Symmetry: D3
Subunit: 273 residues, 6 copies
């Protein structure tokens, strides 16, 4: 299964040489446990939790679904299996749920503020090591959309790249044959001129990086009139305070890496009996 | 070495099928880049960064050391290697430095509030999946200390476990032979009676869970008089506000999972030329 | 190295428990070997071969480059290292070069018959197990272009997918929110009505699957008329005798799986001398 | 499963970050699919395909067996499972069956032209990277026999090895002590004098490399005369037009690498219906 | 689970390219086999055996438990599965049971000689490569106890380390903050003075290395009077002959690496029908 | 490198979460260490030790070679590198050397007793899990020879197999085509009749299992007269006391699994300065 190895590694780091408790547990037995919320938020991590339980021979009796909202004291999951295994898995289970839900929850807050159905919210490649796929998945559960998953997914030319590109148009024109047939090319721009030049060069997507709303609206209006098929993306420390403003700029999407890199754990715990 | 595989996997999830840019880069060449801070903070991730650079054939010309304070616009590292590789590693390098430094920085703030050289600040087993070792290492660079690293490091018995133990003293006495000779046993207690009882039962360490400063002080005073070599730990939603007051209870340590699960990325970026 | 693992596994399956010759070679010594052609074709596998020698401690004294033409008796590579190691890697080296060159060479012939700079030759996801990246790379060295690398690279919908779909336009308009921001959506069509239907649905790419030049040209002219930004791809048993004809249907690309699944080894061998 | 890892890796290289279709499929459901032929040939890959479906949770309702002949339009397999999973494994399934069957089919033709039960058809160590075991297995399903599986399986010495050797008889008499007790030693010979030399040296097998039938027959008659227990193998560009002739030289086996390195995919496809 | 990978690798080294017998087995079929002892001893390896059987699809009908005594001709296990698999697993199954039981048996003999329920018998970090966890587990089944499991479990300072420590007390005092909160520190001492000094410096455990019984007694008596909670361990070529005398010195434990490094295979075999 | 992964895993199990000492080492520095013998024996493990040192960045200044004899107090290796790394590697280095040398030494004792240059000493497939290749290598350094390395190396039909083989001759005759061309077939026999039947059936090798010397001589004499090309092997709890007797039986080789499964650690240690 696609994420099985991920769960194996998550567990392995916690068990190390082997759980010490099972060495002294006088008698193992079947038991039921509940994952309860101690804070409100939106649920994420279901796909991983279920794969983890199945892998460890733990039964998932009941569980709320990804994207579902919850309140403190709410029971999020009911699991049953060997007492020794419920304990060996406890932390790994909670940590992945609290982290995933943390991202989904923070993300849902940005979805509300953005308040739009025409403009999608996006993440970035700023993700914690080994957690890209995990965290991208978590953003989906917050109600937003994902940007590319890696460096093979699409071509994104930013400031650093552009400095070594004499004549963008020529570059983009002859880059197509060396890129996979289905690849889009995005160009990071920091001024109306740059974006305009990007569009004329043959950019599939143009990012309006660190630009005022006015500056962005100008570029969006220009795009609508001359390059109707170029997607526009706004980004650059966009906050909960300014996200709505940019939603009205005319851009197609808005990316904020904070959805992932400023997310924190939603409080939860596991209780027996 | 110990963390090479970690870096390989971190990089692998970003490269996927293969970096697209290197497919169109007309000509590769050696270049120098600098990792610059965009916020104030304490550096962390040095050990991982250097291994990452060495693995990819990138030279580390200069770098500040783990634990060093830095300010915005400060050059954290200077590296040199193939342009294509610098770009292929950039995000992986920045993500691990921003995450690790975020933890160290938040941690350094609790250390400040703690304001004590006798009491130790500790993390918890609440870490992000696959990042146990990474994050525990980050807490150290913040100036705090680590709690156990896993379920194999020490035995920690709490409510969940205790509910199934008839005679705690008997259990601990006969548990030593089935545990590695060097392991310590910690008992989580929610009352003075419980703490006192755990000490008599033979606990090496007692956790004063969710107790007031006064409550904790009473336990510490009892420990000092009757079980001088038993270690005391305070925990349970300790904040930057209450942390100092707890440092005066007489407890030996104070654990706060938030050091890791409430930490966020410190802002940085990489610049060429 | 992104392909380092690939090479370890290739070498491992041939050495098994361990090479038997090294068990009897009384004295090892530094030696030189040459990789010569016994056929003519285009070279491919340079990237993998160099990493292979690097890994095994063999020195690459000289080597022609990928894409370079060669003919019988040509010395393609000169290598030097321990005699035992040269024999242990011999077969692994030749097999990947002969297989890679085989694909590039067969690909270059289709490149000719195509004879065009306005039309791109594309491969397919029809590749040998565990050799995708290896074979897509081999095609490039043949002068052609690669199609997507996998199922994560882009969304390719065919009747199978749309079978249980009734409003293509709405279906795609919603897929966008759930697909990564940079992903293109291609639709396979076996009739004019389908292509025309796709373009109106909002497809980024339309495949003219198993259709006549007249049928293709019909779709092209239509595309040229109303949807100029919709790439068109022709495929379906395109042969080395009909590729040129389709290149004149006004299609942007022509994909042929045969480039990979019909390629065969190019005769080569290694001599000590 | 001995080949379980092989299948995980084959599937992994196609899914990459994750299949994009499952991201948009609003509702998954159980479905059935058929693997049909578009050509005729001998089936191969049964073993790998079953393990593949097992791994992915797809049910194999019906399937022809390895070695079984088939013709265009024949339904080779009937499978059932989640719609999303059938699409995710489709290509991986077909590629291995088409590639495996391709080798078995080409192998069966050489089996005919050979037309003999006293002579064995053998493959070579010339196989595609990472596919040795897979391709040797494929040859068997073609009706032929496998040669050694690797360099650990047996000792095969050629001029390259003996170049710096002056007493074959003593050299081999000593190799025995250093080789595993059960290993056979084969020697490649390009002249009568060499074969005659090998047999006297104590070789278990002699290869008649790139020699005429008359030359081969000379060595055979000699073998039949003094060394009846020395297997003889003929090889060296043996073609589908000269294989039968060599089979009459009194040789025990004829190896032809082309069985694998010249085989190509057999046209097949998958339909839902 | 925790040891599945271990069993996979154990099996993989025996199967290599693939079991030859299954290539000629005319027809496979279900069969029952018994693992029988050919010597007297204490059973060990149950946990590994069961995981091994489950992994390979073999049913465990019956089995004695770890720690149980057995005699020659005793049936240790009864299993059922495919004939081919039983043969493919036989050696792997027997090797791990004979090795593990050999350790448990030798261990049970030192336990007998020790003749005490207050003193613990311990192993060491002297284990065979890749078998640390396997062998530590085997010692337990012999009735003894385990020492630390690795270099991460506890801190052990001996001659090599001490030679570079100016002030031992200072070092230990300031080392606590840099070690996991739960770790114990053991000091290896070669004299009464050293032991006494280590106790004053703050050692959690003191090893009485290569000291006479009288010497060890003096240290134990000192510990009892001044450092009651410091743990004492005796070691250094302790034999079956001297072990009992040491158990009377007052020390808490006695470690002997020989339990593992001088253990040998207990004789067993597998029978069909 | 073929055994690199083996060493990585050996180290990994000892380091676990990470060496605790390096956490408190005030200052690292370069240092020299010596591996000294504390008991006489024959050296084995060189190949692994060197690969281990190179992997950990430790320099091997001096080292005796595999097969070389040593006496107590003798310095076997002189290594230099970071103090922290010499300590992290110490146990892994010693354990592999003491175990390998232990096997080589025990083996050399059997070589002497056998006292022959015409009869080779052999091992079996009775090896500790994960150590087959390691232990087979160790036997070579004792002065003996190896039997097959696994189940793919050769075909060995024993009692269990034979029970399901009606008509051996027919079986062996038609098994050749389904086995790799170079494979030998050995048959385990427990009586003159069985061996005779084995020879007539077409056995490449015949094992004289659990037979008296007389019984074996009879079979050897029969072999010399009728099947001069069949190799003979004696086995069945052959000891140091009876090995010489069997050497005079006329058999080609003698196998004793004890060379490996009854071997124990040769005492050694590491000293600084
Ligand atoms: O590279 C990306 O995918 C990306 C996309 C949008 C915004 N930022 C980034 C970034 O990480 O720099
Ligand atoms: O288990 C631990 O290591 C731990 C130690 C201190 C505080 N909390 C925990 C926890 O994760 O529950
Ligand atoms: O899915 C693909 O990548 C693909 C692209 C072009 C032609 N065929 C295919 C196919 O294998 O169905
Ligand atoms: O080495 C082999 O296995 C082999 C066996 C038969 C024919 N050729 C070869 C070869 O690749 O050189
Ligand atoms: O390091 C250990 O764990 C250890 C513990 C007790 C006795 N010896 C050792 C040793 O291997 O040196
Ligand atoms: O199987 C073997 O290789 C083998 C060879 C000789 C003696 N015993 C065995 C055995 O392990 O049963």
């Amino acid at each position: 299964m696609e994420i099985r190895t991920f769960l194996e590694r998550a567990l392995k780091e916690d068990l190390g040489h082997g759980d010490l408790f099972e060495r002294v547990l006088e008698k193992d037995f079947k038991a039921t446990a509940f994952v309860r919320a101690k804070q409100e938020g939106v649920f994420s991590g279901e796909k991983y939790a279920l794969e983890l339980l199945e892998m460890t021979g733990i039964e998932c009796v009941q569980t709320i679904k990804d994207k579902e909202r919850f309140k403190p004291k709410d029971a999020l999951m009911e699991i049953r299996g060997d007492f020794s295994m419920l304990l060996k898995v406890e932390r790994t289970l909670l940590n992945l749920l609290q982290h995933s839900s943390g991202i989904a929850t923070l993300t849902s807050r940005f979805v509300e503020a953005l308040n739009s159905h025409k403009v999608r919210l996006l993440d970035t490649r700023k993700t914690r090591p080994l957690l890209r796929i995990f965290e991208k998945y978590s953003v989906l559960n917050g109600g937003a959309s994902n940007h590319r998953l890696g460096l093979d997914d699409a071509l994104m030319l930013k400031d650093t790249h552009l400095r070594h590109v004499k004549d963008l148009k020529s570059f983009l024109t002859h880059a197509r044959k060396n890129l996979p047939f289905t690849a889009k090319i995005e160009i990071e721009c920091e001024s109306f001129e740059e974006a305009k030049n990007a569009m004329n060069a043959g950019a599939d997507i143009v990012m309006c990086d660190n630009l005022s709303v006015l500056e962005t609206k100008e570029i969006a209006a220009y795009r609508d009139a001359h390059y109707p098929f170029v997607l526009l993306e706004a980004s650059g420390n966009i906050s909960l305070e300014s996200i709505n403003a940019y939603a009205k700029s005319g851009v197609d999407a808005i990316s904020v890496g904070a959805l992932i890199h400023q997310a924190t754990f939603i409080d939860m715990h596991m209780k027996m009996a």
